[PDB]
């Protein structure tokens, strides 16, 4: 009864802090191509929503665009969840869950999202999961320290109220398995 | 494999413009709440989402919130679009169509909505046509003049330009191309 319920394969879901080596992670894979669905996170979507660029749009003024910015996050997050394949396992950078958990979760904290755009962006969340099959059957957390993080330019206190976040979800509800690599 | 497919009973829904006579025209149906489910435009639930007015907010700043506004709308219809229950007809005061093509769209033409928000949305209505299953079996139209409309709510309030703009979108959506089935309220 929910959308694309039993239409997907076993699913992992590659997590990480902004320059955990997450791109790095999922090249090692592009070799099996054919045998593995494999879907990087939809960034160049975000770059171009029908010529709008709502990723430049939100670093350039956060109050103003990141409850658009996350909402069409949750969207391409959505699409690659459910999109269909024949292939026998599928692997995905990143996830609704960090959308919601991570980055959502910190505009909160920061004053980015006002109280109402937060709280849209969550009854949606809430919908989300009574209408949409999310397939999540294991989760590789490519755990690194803030610090390293910023070797590979983003602030630094962004990548520590990142790292916490991710931390406290998948370390520290989701019953789905996590995988927790040393990524230093 | 839609969300709520096959779990909705014949639906009507009632559209018009602001002050075409729609909670009135629900209204007659109530002495039947046991045989019809009956949903009012969810306005309560837009004046308090956790405690947060959005409806107030939109009004006070429209390039600010209407984004959040028409996405929460979006959401609320969808709920009770999907609602389940066990009558066997089911009426709804507005929809999700009327949000977009209406509403949103207006928003678009006055730059309230910049093209950003706008195509958002817009993807999002995509998403929602290929998951969800919207159940429309027929629309009753409420049609009106601006001029009249203004003046019922005028008497019981919104600029006349905008009841015009509104009126030109539904006449648009409505008449000039589920089966429509217009009613002069005027
Ligand atoms: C998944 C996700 C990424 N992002 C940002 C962080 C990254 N910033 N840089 N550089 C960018 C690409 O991952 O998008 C976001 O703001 N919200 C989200 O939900
Ligand atoms: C259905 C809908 C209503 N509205 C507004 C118009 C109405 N304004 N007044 N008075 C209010 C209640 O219908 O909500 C909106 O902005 N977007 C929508 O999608």
Redesign the pocket.
């Known amino acids: 009864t929910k959308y694309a319920e039993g239409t997907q394969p076993f699913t992992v879901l590659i997590e990480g802090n902004?320059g955990s080596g997450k791109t790095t992670y999922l090249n090692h894979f592009e070799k099996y191509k054919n045998d593995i669905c494999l879907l990087t996170?939809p960034?160049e979507k975000?770059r171009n929503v029908n010529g709008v660029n709502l990723?430049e749009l939100?670093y350039k003024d956060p109050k103003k665009w990141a409850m658009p910015?996350?909402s069409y996050?949750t969207l391409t997050?959505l699409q690659s969840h459910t999109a269909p394949t024949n292939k026998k396992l599928k692997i995905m950078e990143?996830s609704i869950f960090?959308?919601r958990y991570?980055?959502?979760e910190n505009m909160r904290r920061n004053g980015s999202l006002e109280q109402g755009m937060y709280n849209t962006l969550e009854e949606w969340y809430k919908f989300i999961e009574e209408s949409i099959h999310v397939q999540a059957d294991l989760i590789i957390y490519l755990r690194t320290s803030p610090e390293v993080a910023y070797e590979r330019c983003?602030p630094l206190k962004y990548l520590q109220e990142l790292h916490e976040l991710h931390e406290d979800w998948l370390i520290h509800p989701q019953s789905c398995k996590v995988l927790v690599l040393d990524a230093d």
């Open positions: 902004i996170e960034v975000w990723l939100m910015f996350q996050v997050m990143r960090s959308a991570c980055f959502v983003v």
